[PDB]
């Protein structure tokens, strides 16, 4: 079945809760496997201890830059970047999990969780999952963002992994 993974998130060292995500390995197996492996840390690197570096209320919460912690880094389990797998899944609403990028075929490790429908990203960002549980946790993260994307507290994925 599709992986179920989790991110345990804190704000300045205080726990906000758990976000549980389904990864659509059935539609985007390579993108799903990348994220799954970065949650478990099984390749020797990943998301544990990294931050939500860009959080824009009424838009999305962005994370996964585990090298530079600011949107300029990250890498995949494959290499520094990998191709856009397909654009089959769309940005249909809040809770969509999608790859951040710097243009075509630049996926690494950065990702975003949508807090609104972001349909203008369809065909540009590879959607690969959605929130199963903890949209209230996403909403708390969203609360610490700003229109500039800068966060008012340090938002940290303190643990992460695979449930099934
Ligand atoms: C809502 C999603 O928004 C975005 O993706 C907007 N764009 C960014 O944030 N770009 C920053 C970004 C995102 C993903 C990969 C890279 C990258 C690629 C290659 C080498 N180094 C870094 C950069
Ligand atoms: K805007």
Curated annotation (Swiss-Prot):
**Domain of life from the UniProt record:** Eukaryota
Q: What is its EC number?
A: 5.2.1.8
Question: Catalytic activity annotated for this protein?
Answer: [protein]-peptidylproline (omega=180) = [protein]-peptidylproline (omega=0)
Keyword Isomerase tagged: yes
Q: Which residues form the PPIase cyclophilin-type domain?
A: 6-162
Similarity comment: Belongs to the cyclophilin-type PPIase family.
Reported function: PPIase that catalyzes the cis-trans isomerization of proline imidic peptide bonds in oligopeptides and may therefore assist protein folding. Involved in regulation of the mitochondrial permeability transition pore (mPTP). It is proposed that its association with the mPTP is masking a binding site for inhibiting inorganic phosphate (Pi) and promotes the open probability of the mPTP leading to apoptosis or necrosis; the requirement of the PPIase activity for this function is debated. In cooperation with mitochondrial p53/TP53 is involved in activating oxidative stress-induced necrosis.
Tell me what this protein is called.
Peptidyl-prolyl cis-trans isomerase F, mitochondrial
Q: Can you name the source organism?
A: Homo sapiens (Human)
Q: What gene name is listed for this protein?
A: PPIF
């Amino acid at each position: 079945g599709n992986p179920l993974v989790y991110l345990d998130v804190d704000a300045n060292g205080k726990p906000l809760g758990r976000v549980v995500l389904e990864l659509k390995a059935d539609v985007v197996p390579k993108t799903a496997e990348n994220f799954r492996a970065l949650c478990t840390g099984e390749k020797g690197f990943g998301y544990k201890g990294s931050t939500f570096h860009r959080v824009i209320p009424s838009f999305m919460c962005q994370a996964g830059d585990f090298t530079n912690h600011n949107g300029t880094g990250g890498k995949s389990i494959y290499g520094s970047r990998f191709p856009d797998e397909n654009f089959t899944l769309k940005h249909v609403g809040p809770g969509v999990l999608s790859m951040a990028n710097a243009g075509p075929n630049t996926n690494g490790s950065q990702f975003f969780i949508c807090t609104i429908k972001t349909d203008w990203l369809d065909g540009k960002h590879v959607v690969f999952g959605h929130v199963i549980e903890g949209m209230d946790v996403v909403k708390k993260i969203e609360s610490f963002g700003s229109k500039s994307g800068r966060t008012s507290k340090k938002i940290v994925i303190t643990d992460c992994g695979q449930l099934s």
